[PDB]
Structures are given as structure tokens and as C-alpha cells.
Amino acid sequence: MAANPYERGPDPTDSSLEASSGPFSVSETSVSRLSASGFGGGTIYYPTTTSEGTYGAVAISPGYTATQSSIAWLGPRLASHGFVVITIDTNTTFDQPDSRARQLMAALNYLVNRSSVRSRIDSSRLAVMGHSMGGGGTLRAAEDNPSLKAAIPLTPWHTNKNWSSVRVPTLIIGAENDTIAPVSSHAKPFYNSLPSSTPKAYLELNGASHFAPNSSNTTIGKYSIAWLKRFVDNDTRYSQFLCPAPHDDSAISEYRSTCPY
Numbered sequence: 001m002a003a004n005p006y007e008r009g010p011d012p013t014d015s016s017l018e019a020s021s022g023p024f025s026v027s028e029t030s031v032s033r034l035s036a037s038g039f040g041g042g043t044i045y046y047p048t049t050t051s052e053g054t055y056g057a058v059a060i061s062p063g064y065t066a067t068q069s070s071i072a073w074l075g076p077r078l079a080s081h082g083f084v085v086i087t088i089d090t091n092t093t094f095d096q097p098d099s100r101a102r103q104l105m106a107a108l109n110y111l112v113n114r115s116s117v118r119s120r121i122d123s124s125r126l127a128v129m130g131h132s133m134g135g136g137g138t139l140r141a142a143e144d145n146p147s148l149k150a151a152i153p154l155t156p157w158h159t160n161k162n163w164s165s166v167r168v169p170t171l172i173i174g175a176e177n178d179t180i181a182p183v184s185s186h187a188k189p190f191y192n193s194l195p196s197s198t199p200k201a202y203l204e205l206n207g208a209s210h211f212a213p214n215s216s217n218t219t220i221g222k223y224s225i226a227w228l229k230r231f232v233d234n235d236t237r238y239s240q241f242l243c244p245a246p247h248d249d250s251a252i253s254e255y256r257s258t259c260p261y
Ligand code: NA
Pocket: 246, 247, 248, 249, 250, 251, 252, 253, 254
């Protein structure tokens, strides 16, 4: 048995992470707006199998004026690698980022305590993600809830630029040609303010618009999966994608250098 009891699925490859689906078949259920205390409802995507143990859970928020359909593809994509994922609707489509932060946490509370799939979740291993204002809410949720295992803001928007108290491993994905949340005034200031003592990464999508996260995207899927695996599951098999090095080659037992050059 692996030393890490949270490892799920076979050893990853670039190919397996760029594929449309991971190794786990995915089921889905929903929670109504009425039943969702503190948020607007959502769709829950979960691995059908339970035979390898419980999974971490992820709540995902859409952005301003948007609904679940703008983030729906992430549900099956991420759940098929071994996560329980809820794509939420917000109380109103005009909710601001700090409101969306509270709703992300309310959705995780629902999943862990009241959902029909709560028995498939390890409640000690939770994460937040979101698009646009939902990505701003992801940063605020991470700042206010340091027990979270990971946070992934996608083309985030927020008026607060200072996230120097965030102690949750955070991957920010920006869009090079974003004109709605320009990376020069949102994503990059956010990343630069994060403490260097917090595990973090900034990934910028070449040529991309603000709406790249709303359609199936091989790059977003690959690095989102690797981030959640590495930090929600403590799965160091995924370090190779986040921190590539020649020693990832099976022919190379050690590689040291004064890179970059
Ligand atoms: Na090696």
C-alpha cells in the first residue's frame, strides 16, 4: 500500500491529465435553491466508485451575471480524477466577490454535513475554485478559512489587491488578453501579494480571453487537476507537472542546476 493513504487512481501522465476524462466514472445529483442553505443550489459531480476510499471535495463559483452552466464542464472533468465537486449557483447573479466567498463555504458545509454523497467525502480535505468574481471569492474564502487545502482562482476579479494573509496553496490562472479582469490589475497583483511561504503558482493562458474558463480547456483542466491532487490529496506524484525537472525522466536519478538560464 502507498505510504500516502489519500492517493487515488493510477500514476498520472501528461496524456491522462490532458484527456477529456480521468479514470473514474462520474455520477451526478443536484441540490435545489431551497435546500441549499446559504447559496443558490448546485450540481454535485462525484466518482461512482467508493472502493479506494473517500475523496476530497471542491466547491466552484461562477462569476458576475453567470450561472452554473458557465462552469459546468469542470464538474465531470475534475470529479473523474477522484474528487466530489459542486458547481453552485449564487443567491443572486449580482452577488459580489466577498458574498460568493461565503457561499462557497456554505456549499462545502452542505456537502460535508447534509448532501446525499457526504459519506464519500473526507471532510478534512476541502478546496475552493471560481471564475471571475467567483475567483475573487475564492481568494477571500482562502484568506478567511486557512484550513482549506487548496484554492484555484480562474481569471479572478476583485477590488482588493492584497492577499498577503493567504496561507492556502493557491494556483491563479490568468488570461493573457483578458479585458474584463486584466491580469495587470487583477491576477498578477493577486499572485504577487501572496506570501512566498505559501505554495503558489501563476499560470497565464496564451492569447486567452476572460471566458476561456467557461469552455472545455485542456490546460485549465490539466493544471487544476494537478494542483488539487498535490494539495488536497498530498499526492506528490503530481509534483512533476507543477515543478517539472529532468529527474522526472526514469533514466535520470538526480538533476541539479543553476537554472534558469
Ligand atoms: Na528519474
